[PDB]
């Protein structure tokens, strides 16, 4: 079977899938269990060896999507799909999830010096695993290429149990959990990839929505000193859908709210010591406690209950400002969109059908924005059905006369907006940007949020030669363009410039475009980008 | 455990189940494997002295709900569902598979002489199973109200293996299988169900969808000749949204163009003797070839594939001219609707989009109506998204132009005025009809199709008082007006009657009302209904 040896001279075992060699399920920390919620991860401790690693370990803990301190019944659905016996069979969740998951081309040798693409996965900070996005489709691709690499997969905590915040967390320095988690899976890598046959100095970091905005927040992390025992943790970032978080310190106004309501959910309310009473509640309260805040599918919607924010120490101030002044690992970069991120979305206000309840909308999700900022911001997304997301489609699409309008604020702030800022201020390295529209018709939905998901990981689509091909010769190359693709990647330097910078997707092949479009919309979120935060 | 003795004299055990005690997956006919498909039931001949019956069998075969003789992601995303082994785990399917299943109040002895409900499930004539419509809702209210009742609930083959049809089948007498299946089930119950405690003399069919059309096609079963050994099988009836199959008979048009596509699609295009290649085809090969068939969620929508059809056997003639010319039971009868029956399935058509679009797919649908009947179809049916279904939702729900228009005419057709031809028509017995408005704002679905079987088996809301109480008490007592509604339930005499004549239900509960809506478009499909027929 293969084996690896570790850095500590631990020998493992793997499984050969034929199609690729797997070590899964490896502990990378102690379990965050008990006393040990919501803090720093602490470097796993015991040995390994002559252990197998076969299967992926479970997941942690997943917050319902409908969860909320109301009752309906897409919060009961949903809870009696993930409460059943058949669900948990098949994805089965723990406190107890700290694991990293290394998947290589059969045949690889320690010593090999593969390219490594460190895969963070997304699901709002609140649902996930590693287990959903399997890696054998780019493994595979990358052998055919002839620039195999090895894939690596970092489980990491959501939700309450990886993104609590309010002051106490603060005060105590564990904010960001999940992030750390992630960052310590990083460490593992380096210290211990090339056994199974990686490159250390050949780290690529990607991810995709919440995946891809925590690969943001670890160029901007310790204000951008990616350093490791004096090397850096990675030389490239790809990052599908989603840039800056958005969002205002650990111990602003809505991490202590979150943080409140799930301190009364899980019985604390009357405790002095309110992170000692969460650490010695059951599993099952804390996950009650959890399910009784918005997930990301209530009504709330991506004003997330759990999210990365700025906590003076490892995240030292607003995301968009550290980009700004330059705080930020210098590596080169992919960052890309789907054309209608936000239409799924929109889906969690379709209670909102006039302009009045719009505006309170906006106002409830941007409580820093001013009525002045709000106008600007409705003059520059109208009501006009024609002008909202799914873009394009005319008067189809119109669940509501507020839907599309909602759909595209959404997914402007959170995305596609969000990428172009990033893109104007980052010097870091060289850049590449894409936007898909593959999907273009679809009903509703368009070119919807993690449709690329299924393009990378799924079923072979036009969208695929960007998703594998171009990403793994990134990651091999420093250039997506090593891929032979059909159309030449052109280099994006600013929203600005005077040529196409876009590489575009249809359900045809490639073409090239500009990142020129809904400037208004740019001027409204992004002149103040701290007004729209949550 | 609980024990009965049927009438060959066989004890068999069920499952104490406390709630409840079941008797499940009780064989009725003989496997109708191999040289029996498509052919009449043979009536199980062994012995089942002894033997435990306290889990349910597997389904019959499923039809993918978007199968097609086309390739596309919905098709394909399905088959990976159903072909899964966790869906195969929970929901096992078998040609295998004639099974009747008896659920009685816990404590009920032979003798008890309780009324029994004989529930025929739905799904499109294409899916479903007995499993998946769970009696203890029923039951548990039954005993509520001091009405207990048994739930008997008959499996039958469904799409190509129970509905298969063309000129072969014909002339071999073997049309409309899995009807010919619930009616051996409903005579095991007349010989078999007192052994469980149950009254043959007092059972009410009931069914939703496919179920309900298929309780219409035992009302003018054998020209309405519903005796068995003299007695009728059935005293009353309960239709959930639908009436008569607005069908063509079983050696027309389309019933030989399906034929003739699923012969070539199983490999026996060349054979001289079709039915007999049929036969001899493995398990696996018929369902491919039936996956190869347009399912009900595919764009041909409503116009099924498989579905009963007059066989000038036992349904002799045009289903809409056998309750027009009295060939019925006269029994009394309850019959009703959700009031937007059409909004999952115009999700089949969002490419449709233009008037000319729409008509085109009208007569595709239609193949016997004229351009004047189309003419008089589309005008009683206007693009005004205003008024198509979601009804009385506005400018709302508008995912096309087309959809809300295409919604509604699927619903009347398929439902909603056959419901209103039916009482209109039928005087062999008391008729009492209701409209559910229970999801009036639900997005873009309203009070959509199958969303009784949730009030009814898995969860309570204003509905079930309907849906279990009402039912249950015409059931015993051939009255719902017994259970005791805060609402009395008027009795309905037809569509012109003075008063209100249909029970109502919305969030809040009961009130009356009158079926006297769309009436253009009730006479543009029913002056002549066999215009509009598939
Ligand atoms: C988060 O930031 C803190 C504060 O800068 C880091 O803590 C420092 O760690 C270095 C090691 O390089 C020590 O030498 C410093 O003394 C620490 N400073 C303080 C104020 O404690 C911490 O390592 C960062 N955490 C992560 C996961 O990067
Ligand atoms: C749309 O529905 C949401 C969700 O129910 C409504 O917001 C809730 O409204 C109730 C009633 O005021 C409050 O108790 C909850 O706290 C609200 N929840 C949240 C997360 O805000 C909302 O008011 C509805 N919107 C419109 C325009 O009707
Ligand atoms: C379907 O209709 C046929 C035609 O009436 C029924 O066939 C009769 O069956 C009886 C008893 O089984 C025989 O004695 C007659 O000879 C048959 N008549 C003819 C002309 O076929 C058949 O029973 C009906 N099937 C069901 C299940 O009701
Ligand atoms: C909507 O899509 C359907 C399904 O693809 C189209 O119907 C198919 O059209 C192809 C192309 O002509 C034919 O080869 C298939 O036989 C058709 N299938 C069926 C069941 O009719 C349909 O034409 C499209 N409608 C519009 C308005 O574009
Ligand atoms: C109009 C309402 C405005 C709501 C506030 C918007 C501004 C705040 C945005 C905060 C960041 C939220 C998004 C973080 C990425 C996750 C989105 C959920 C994705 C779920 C799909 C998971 C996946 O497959 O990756
Ligand atoms: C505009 C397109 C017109 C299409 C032709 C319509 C006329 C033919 C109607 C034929 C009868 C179809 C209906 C039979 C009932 C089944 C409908 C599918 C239900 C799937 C849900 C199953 C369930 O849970 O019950």
Same mark, same amino acid.
């Given at each position: 079977?293969?084996?690896?040896?570790?850095?500590?001279?631990?020998?493992?075992?793997?499984?050969?899938?034929? @199609?690729?060699?797997?070590?899964?399920?490896?502990?990378?920390?102690?379990?965050?269990?008990?006393?040990?919620?919501?803090?720093?991860?602490?470097?796993?401790?015991?040995?390994?060896?002559?252990?197998?690693?076969?299967?992926? %370990?479970?997941?942690?803990?997943?917050?319902?999507?409908?969860?909320?301190?109301?009752?309906?019944?897409?919060?009961?659905?949903?809870?009696?799909?993930?409460?059943?016996? /058949?669900?948990?069979?098949?994805?089965?969740?723990?406190?107890?999830?700290?694991?990293?998951?290394?998947?290589?081309?059969?045949?690889?040798?320690?010593?090999?010096?593969?390219?490594?693409?460190?895969?963070?996965?997304?699901?709002?900070?609140? @649902?996930?695993?590693?287990?959903?996005?399997?890696?054998?489709?780019?493994?595979?691709?990358? /052998?055919?290429?002839?620039?195999?690499?090895?894939?690596?997969?970092?489980?990491?905590?959501?939700?309450?149990?990886? &993104?609590?915040?309010?002051?106490?967390?603060?005060?105590?320095?564990? %904010?960001?959990?999940?992030?750390?988690?992630?960052?310590?899976?990083?460490?593992?890598?380096?210290?211990?990839?090339?056994?199974?046959?990686?490159?250390?100095?050949?780290?690529?970091?990607?991810?995709?929505?919440?995946?891809?905005?925590? /690969?943001?927040?670890?160029?901007?992390?310790?204000?951008?000193?990616?350093?490791?025992?004096?090397?850096?943790? &990675?030389?490239?970032?790809?990052?599908?859908?989603?840039?800056?978080?958005?969002?205002?310190?650990? +111990?602003?106004?809505? %991490?202590?709210?979150?943080?409140?309501?799930?301190?009364?959910?899980?019985?604390? $309310?009357?405790?002095?010591?309110?992170?000692?009473?969460?650490?010695?509640?059951?599993?099952?309260?804390?996950?009650?406690?959890? =399910?009784?805040?918005?997930?990301?599918?209530?009504?709330?919607?991506?004003?997330?209950?759990?999210?990365?924010?700025?906590?003076?120490? =490892?995240?030292?101030?607003?995301?968009?400002?550290?980009?700004?002044?330059?705080?930020?690992?210098?590596?080169?970069?992919?960052?890309?969109?789907?054309?209608?991120? $936000?239409?799924?979305?929109?889906?969690?206000?379709?209670?909102?059908?006039?302009?009045?309840?719009?505006? !309170?909308?906006?106002?409830?999700?941007?409580?820093?924005?001013?009525?002045?900022?709000?106008?600007?911001?409705? !003059?520059?997304?109208?009501?006009?059905?024609?002008? %909202?997301?799914?873009?394009?489609?005319?008067?189809?699409?119109?669940?509501?006369?507020?839907?599309?309008? @909602?759909?595209?604020?959404?997914?402007?702030?959170?995305?596609?907006?969000?990428?172009?800022?990033?893109?104007?201020?980052?010097?870091?390295?060289?850049?590449?940007?894409?936007?898909?529209?593959?999907?273009?018709?679809?009903?509703?939905?368009?070119?919807?949020?993690? =449709?690329?998901?299924?393009?990378? +990981?799924?079923?072979?689509?036009?969208?695929?030669? @960007?998703?594998?091909?171009?990403?793994?010769?990134? !990651?091999?190359?420093?250039?997506?363009?090593?891929?032979?693709?059909?159309?030449?990647?052109?280099?994006?330097?600013?929203?600005?410039?005077?040529?196409?910078?876009?590489?575009?997707?249809?359900?045809?092949?490639?073409?090239?475009?500009?990142?020129?479009?809904?400037?208004?919309?740019?001027?409204?979120?992004?002149?103040?980008?701290?007004?729209?935060? /949550?």
């Amino acid at each position: 079977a293969p084996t690896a040896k570790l850095a500590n001279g631990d020998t493992i075992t793997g499984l050969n899938a034929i @199609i690729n060699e797997a070590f899964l399920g490896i502990p990378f920390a102690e379990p965050p269990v008990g006393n040990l919620r919501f803090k720093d991860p602490v470097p796993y401790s015991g040995s390994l060896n002559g252990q197998k690693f076969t299967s992926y %370990g479970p997941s942690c803990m997943q917050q319902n999507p409908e969860g909320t301190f109301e009752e309906n019944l897409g919060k009961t659905a949903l809870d009696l799909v993930m409460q059943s016996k /058949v669900f948990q069979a098949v994805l089965p969740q723990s406190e107890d999830c700290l694991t990293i998951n290394v998947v290589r081309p059969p045949g690889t040798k320690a010593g090999a010096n593969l390219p490594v693409m460190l895969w963070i996965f997304g699901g709002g900070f609140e @649902i996930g695993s590693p287990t959903i996005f399997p890696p054998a489709q780019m493994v595979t691709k990358s /052998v055919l290429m002839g620039k195999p690499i090895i894939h690596v997969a970092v489980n990491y905590r959501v939700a309450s149990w990886g &993104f609590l915040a309010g002051d106490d967390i603060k005060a105590e320095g564990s %904010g960001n959990a999940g992030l750390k988690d992630q960052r310590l899976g990083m460490q593992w890598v380096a210290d211990n990839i090339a056994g199974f046959g990686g490159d250390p100095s050949k780290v690529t970091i990607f991810g995709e929505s919440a995946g891809s905005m925590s /690969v943001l927040c670890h160029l901007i992390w310790n204000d951008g000193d990616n350093t490791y025992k004096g090397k850096p943790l &990675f030389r490239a970032g790809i990052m599908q859908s989603g840039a800056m978080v958005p969002s205002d310190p650990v +111990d602003g106004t809505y %991490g202590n709210e979150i943080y409140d309501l799930f301190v009364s959910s899980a019985g604390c $309310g009357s405790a002095s010591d309110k992170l000692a009473c969460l650490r010695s509640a059951s599993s099952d309260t804390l996950l009650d406690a959890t =399910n009784n805040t918005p997930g990301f599918l209530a009504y709330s919607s991506l004003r997330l209950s759990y999210l990365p924010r700025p906590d003076g120490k =490892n995240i030292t101030d607003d995301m968009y400002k550290l980009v700004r002044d330059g705080k930020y690992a210098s590596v080169p970069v992919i960052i890309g969109d789907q054309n209608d991120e $936000g239409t799924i979305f929109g889906l969690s206000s379709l209670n909102v059908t006039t302009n009045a309840q719009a505006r !309170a909308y906006f106002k409830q999700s941007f409580i820093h924005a001013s009525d002045a900022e709000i106008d600007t911001l409705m !003059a520059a997304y109208p009501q006009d059905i024609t002008q %909202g997301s799914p873009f394009d489609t005319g008067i189809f699409n119109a669940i509501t006369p507020q839907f599309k309008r @909602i759909s595209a604020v959404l997914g402007d702030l959170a995305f596609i907006h969000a990428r172009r800022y990033f893109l104007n201020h980052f010097q870091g390295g060289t850049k590449y940007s894409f936007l898909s529209k593959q999907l273009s018709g679809l009903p509703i939905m368009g070119t919807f949020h993690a =449709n690329d998901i299924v393009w990378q +990981d799924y079923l072979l689509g036009s969208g695929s030669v @960007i998703y594998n091909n171009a990403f793994i010769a990134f !990651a091999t190359d420093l250039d997506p363009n090593t891929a032979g693709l059909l159309v030449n990647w052109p280099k994006y330097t600013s929203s600005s410039q005077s040529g196409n910078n876009l590489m575009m997707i249809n359900a045809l092949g490639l073409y090239t475009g500009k990142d020129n479009f809904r400037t208004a919309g740019y001027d409204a979120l992004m002149t103040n980008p701290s007004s729209f935060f /949550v």
